[PDB]
Amino acid sequence: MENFQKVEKIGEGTYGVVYKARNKLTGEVVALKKIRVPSTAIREISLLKELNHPNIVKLLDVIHTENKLYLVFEFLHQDLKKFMDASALTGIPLPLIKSYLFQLLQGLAFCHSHRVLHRDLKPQNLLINTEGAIKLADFGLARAFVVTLWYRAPEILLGCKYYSTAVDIWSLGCIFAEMVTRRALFPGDSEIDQLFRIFRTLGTPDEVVWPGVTSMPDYKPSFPKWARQDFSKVVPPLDEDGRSLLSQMLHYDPNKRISAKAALAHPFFQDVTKPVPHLRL
């Protein structure tokens, strides 16, 4: 903490405050994260350091000093939330949405193959650079260690404590929809509002569509029954390839919901390219 000249506070996270900081000895600009320490956690984090991929924001150093923890990460200039806001009036071009989504699925497919889950994907954890790359931040901190419930998967909301990599697919599906319509898909303001927002669009799940759902911890027989809506009405004007992919990412049953690896082979990515965005830094 003495070797860093904190420039600005980049924002608070689920596990701590992040600062844009400049390393004194090296001059390099990094993202320093002060974790808000157990032995398990240290080991957890230390595995994440060796998890390298072009679509994962790199964990550079871990500093446990004076019984405090700080994580040093590579720095990217803008998050997807700010870029979306900037493009609110015109929307993000489909060719760019398609490239960002393809890159994110590659990152997830890498993490998921190493049994690492993000568990808290949101536009704010997605970082972009001038070269057209997009990277995931916070990967693996959930395991080792007002909040937005907008991108939370149904199984978490219903009390499943042993969730899987499918939760990340769901969150990504929610971000995919938001980039296309320029409006949050399920903006719930509490857990039950969140749940009901999902039920009102996708229909209240039952044993036909989701076997075992009625035996979930927080499922109540008293849940109102809503019918399912046409996706054509939910995500206009996404073409049929996009909508079919989206429906596979938003399946209720985690076991049925598409994997990141299978998603990469979907017809929607037949014409992917890597356009370079216009970023105002």
Ligand SMILES: N=C(N)NS(=O)(=O)c1ccc(N/C=C2\C(=O)Nc3ccccc32)cc1
């Ligand atoms: N607020 C500013 N300055 N611009 S911005 O809002 O687009 C913005 C700019 C940079 C970042 N970067 C965040 C991060 C970064 O670079 N690496 C990380 C690793 C872990 C957690 C967060 C980060 C996040 C937001």
